[PDB]
Each structure stands twice: as C-alpha cells, then as structure tokens.
Amino acid sequence: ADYQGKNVVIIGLGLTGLSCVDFFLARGVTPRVMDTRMTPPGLDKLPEAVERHTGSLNDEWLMAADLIVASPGIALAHPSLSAAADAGIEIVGDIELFCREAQAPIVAITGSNGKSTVTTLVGEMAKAAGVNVGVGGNIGLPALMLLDDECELYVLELSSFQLETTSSLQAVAATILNVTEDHMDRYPFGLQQYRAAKLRIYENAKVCVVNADDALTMPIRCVSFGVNMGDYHLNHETWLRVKGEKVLNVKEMKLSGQHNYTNALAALALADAAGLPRASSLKALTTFTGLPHRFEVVLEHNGVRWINDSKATNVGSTEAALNGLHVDGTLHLLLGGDGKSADFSPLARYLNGDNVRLYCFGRDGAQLAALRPEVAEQTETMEQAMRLLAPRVQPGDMVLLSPACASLDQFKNFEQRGNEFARLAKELG
Ligand SMILES: CC(=O)N[C@H]1[C@@H](OP(=O)(O)OP(=O)(O)OC[C@H]2O[C@@H](n3ccc(=O)[nH]c3=O)[C@H](O)[C@@H]2O)O[C@H](CO)[C@@H](O)[C@@H]1O[C@H](C)C(=O)N[C@@H](C)C(=O)N[C@H](CCC(=O)O)C(=O)O
C-alpha cells in the first residue's frame, strides 16, 4: 500500500511496535505511538523524533488517525479501539502490513500447540533445499524485520491475536495445527471466538492443511494430516506416510512423541504445498533437535532428568508432555503462573498414582494444587517450589516444568521462566 501523508498511530511499544515505527519512518511517514503501560519496555529504543504517549490509550490520537496499527497485545475489543472501528478508522496489525509488502510465498502456521516446532521445521526444510527463507512472526522475530528482496519463502508463526487484525494474507499453504482452550482472557465469547480468529488463516490460502483428528481445525477441500487418518498419517516402530506410502521411519528423527510425529507430518504437508523437494524436506526432519524451553532436558545427573517445558503455557501443551510420559521413579511436576481463566481439569487424569508430586505456584497456584490436593504443595514462586522439591528428588525421578500457564504474572516471558528453572536445576541437581 501507499501510506504517504497518512496520520498513522501505532499501539504498542514492544517488539512489534518498534518494528512498525521503523517500517513507517523508512517510507517517509512519521507515526505516533502509544502504549497503556506506564513504562513500556521499548521506550528507550524509540527514536527521539517520534511522538509517544504512555500510561493509557490516547483517544485524541486514535480518533484523528487515518490508520491504526495495533500490536497483538491489545484487544480489538478495547473500548477506545472499538470506538475507532465504529468511526470507520482502518485498524491493521504488523502481519497485515507485512502481507501487503511481501514478494515471496508465505507459509502460515497457527494452533494452540506445536506451531513453533512446525514453523521451525518448515524453515529447516527450506534451508535444506537451498532456499533463501525468512522465518518469524509470533515465534519471536517481528515479520516486518524479515522483509528482504532476496527472500524466496517466508514462514510465519501466527497467533490468534495477529490473525484477528490480518485481512490480506494469501498463504501458499496454511494450517491450524489444533485448537484447545487458551487465551480465554482475550476471548469473552469463548472457544468458538478463539477458533474464529484462527480460521482466518485459511482465507485465500492456496492449500489449507487441517488436522484430521481435530475438527475445530477445519474450515467448513483441505489436505489433512493425522495419526490413523489423513493424507499424511502415521503407520505403526512408527512411520511417516503420505497416502499409504512410507516416507520416513521416525527412528531417523531426533524429536520423539506422537504429537511431534504429527508435527512432522504437518511440516511435510506445508513444505510439499510450498513446492519444496520432499527429499531435502525429509533430511531436515532427521537433523532438527528441537527448541529451547520445549520439553528440553537441561540437566541429567544422578539418575534424574530435569526438563524445561516452560513453553507449555496452556493445558493442551502440558497434556502433550504428560500423555504417555515414562518416569522410572516419581514425577515432580511444577505447575503455575497465570492460567488465563483455563479449566485445568483435563490434567487431572494424568495425576493419579503413588508416583506423582505437584508443586504449584504463581497467580493460579491454589487452583492447580486443587487438582489433587493430597499430593500437592503450593508456594508463591517457582524458586520456592524448586528448593522445596529438590531435597525430595531420588535417582530415577523426573523434575518437569510444564506449567500449563503464562509466565507473565511473575516473569518477563516463558524464556525467562525456563532460564531460571535451568539455573536452579543446575544448582540443586
Ligand atoms: C502479546 C503478544 O502477542 N506478543 C507478541 C508480540 O510481542 P510484542 O513485544 O510486540 O508484544 P506487545 O503487543 O507489545 O504486548 C506485550 C505485552 O504488553 C501488553 N500491552 C501491549 C500494548 C499496550 O498498549 N498495552 C499492554 O498492556 C500486552 O497485553 C502483552 O502482555 O510480537 C512478537 C513478534 O510477532 C511475538 O513474538 C510476541 O509473542 C509472544 C511470545 C506472546 O506473548 N504471544 C502471545 C500470543 C501470548 O499471549 N503468548 C503467551 C506467552 C506467555 C509467556 O511468555 O509466558 C501465552 O499466554 O501463551
């Protein structure tokens, strides 16, 4: 698009907002930027010339705007933003701005769990084929920072928040990996509203890739992946298959776990649709080792594995860690933080038996301990929980941080939570 001479207002002085400020300045447009936080993190990095407003949204600025660029961390339902929308003021996000500018095909990936793994895998598959690939989005690198005339393929992890404000995405291949309750603090019309945000990813996608085992991933035809069903499916040793043909024995993969094998199927389906050679795509599957904070063994010592799964910020993710988990002794499970109004009940079925202890902390600690009080301890912080469990740990035990919650009540982000866990594990283990 052409933004020359438009009154542009950006909401958010985080990573996204700073990238948008630069995007507009490079195009001869000086935006104004606001943030409801009194002392937002990006204040220091904001150029001196750019007007900024903190501590609230500025309605004088909003209602004067020709274009509002809303960071994914502000709800469109915010009264100030809904007022602007009612006035017919255009509201977009950074992913929208990116789509308007991108000059290479985009693979777009969302879902309640697995989306960083699949995004990274597709990136690895592209690299294995010698394709100049830009990987970013919700995974951490703001999409506008990917824009590159030499880029041949973009792979974007997209949150439901980012999808709400995106209207111009025409993916070469798009997927919703799964939909499980998350972000209910942002979705007062519940699961179907959350789902509706994710379903936007399929609009004008060349190929849609759905989860045959999760009907909420389906639009209302798509390529499918699944365990026993799907164009891409598993054949049990376990094999990855594409329509009945064996393509990879998963003993060649570094990743393990059935949910990671279906993640590999999703990645391969997207890579196939994007036109990458299957051979090099399969190669990438055999080399990829995983992501930080995603069921990451940070210490294995004295017959105990200490596993950082801080990236488990919802119940579905912690289920993926627990479902089929083999532990030789006792599982010491750390749960807690901001549960975002989730129902934690689905976890209860994994918490039976003589060999599970729960250490619950943060905002929703009490609600988590309530899953099975008789084997639960509640503390205020994760450090207190660690120092509590550590003396009790015996050879053969597992210590698992898979907290089923956001970290943001006590931590900067889930990476900080994971780093602190790994530090404490190395101290106490
Ligand atoms: C909230 C959000 O969507 N964050 C994504 C965003 O980062 P950013 O630095 O630009 O974020 P932001 O829009 O400034 O908001 C950051 C925080 O400031 C708050 N904020 C923001 C603007 C404002 O005016 N007022 C305000 O209070 C937001 O509510 C949020 O708590 O843009 C980056 C590049 O695209 C993303 O990598 C990053 O993803 C993260 C990891 C994330 O938080 N994503 C969302 C989907 C989310 O809620 N994830 C959490 C993680 C919790 C945790 O880390 O423990 C979760 O609940 O799963």
Which CATH code, of 3.50.50.60, 3.90.190.20, 1.10.357.10, 3.90.1150.10, is assigned to 291-426?
A: 3.90.190.20
CA angle 420, 180, 421 (to 5 degrees): 5
Residue nearest to atom 31 of ligand 1 (CA): 73
386 lines ligand 1 (CB under 6 A): no
Phi, psi of 424 (to 5 degrees): -65, -35
Collapsed DSSP state (helix, strand, coil) of residue 67: strand
> What is the spatial distance between Cα 232 and Cα 242, in angstroms, rounded to a whole number?
5
- DSSP of 4-37: TT--EEEE--SHHHHHHHHHHHTTT---EEEESS
Dump the DSSP string for 358-375.
EEEESTTHHHHHTTSGGG
Q: Which residues pair with 69 in a beta bridge?
A: 10, 92
The CA distance from 244 to 247, in Å, is 9
DSSP secondary structure code for residue 425 in this structure: H
| Every domain of the chain and the residues it spans | 1-92, 93-290, 291-426
Q: Whose CA is nearest to atom 5 of ligand 1?
A: 138
Same CATH topology for 1-92 and 291-426: the answer is no
The total of other beta-carbon atoms located within 10 Å of residue 185's CB is 13
Listed residue (147, 131, 159, 29) closest to 99, CA to CA = 147
Alpha-carbon distances of 118 from 159, 163, 303, 309, rounded to whole Å: 13, 17, 31, 17
**CB 90 within 8 Å of CB 81:** no
Question: What is the C-alpha to C-alpha distance for residues 328 and 281, in angstroms, rounded to an integer?
Answer: 35
CATH of 93-290, one of 3.40.1190.10, 1.10.10.1800, 3.50.50.60, 3.60.20.40: 3.40.1190.10
Centre of ligand 1 from the C-alpha of residue 50, in Å: 22
Asked if 76 contacts 163 with a C-beta cutoff of 8 angstroms, the reply is no
Collapsing DSSP to helix, strand or coil, 241 comes out as strand
Task: Copy the structure tokens of residue 116.
Answer: 């960083």
Ligand 1 centroid to residue 353 C-alpha, Å: 37
Residue 262 CB less than 6 A away from ligand 1: no
Provide φ and ψ at 371, rounded to 5°: -60, -45
Looking at CATH, the fold of the domain delimited by 1-92 is given as: Rossmann fold (3.40.50)
Expressed in Å, this structure's resolution amounts to: 1.7
Q: In what order do the strands lie in the sheet with 173-176?
A: 133-137, 153-157, 106-110, 173-176, 207-211, 223-225, 232-235, 239-242, 245-249
> Would you say the CB of residue 403 lies under 6 angstroms from ligand 1?
no
Smallest CA-to-CA distance from 163 within 171, 154, 153 is with 171
Residue 245 vs residues 248, 255, 266, 280, 417: alpha-carbon distances, Å: 9, 21, 16, 17, 42
* Residues designated as active site: 115, 138, 183
Rg, the chain, Cα only = 22
Name the residue of 15, 201, 314, 420 whose CB sits within 8 Å of the most ligand 1 atoms, as the mutation to test its pocket. Answer: 15
Name the structure determination technique: X-ray
Q: From 144, 153, 126, 413, select the one nearest 292 (Cα to Cα).
A: 413
CA distances in angstroms from 393 to 210, 322, 397, listed in the order given: 42, 19, 6
- Rounded to 10 deg, the angle between the 115-128 and 278-287 helix axes is 120
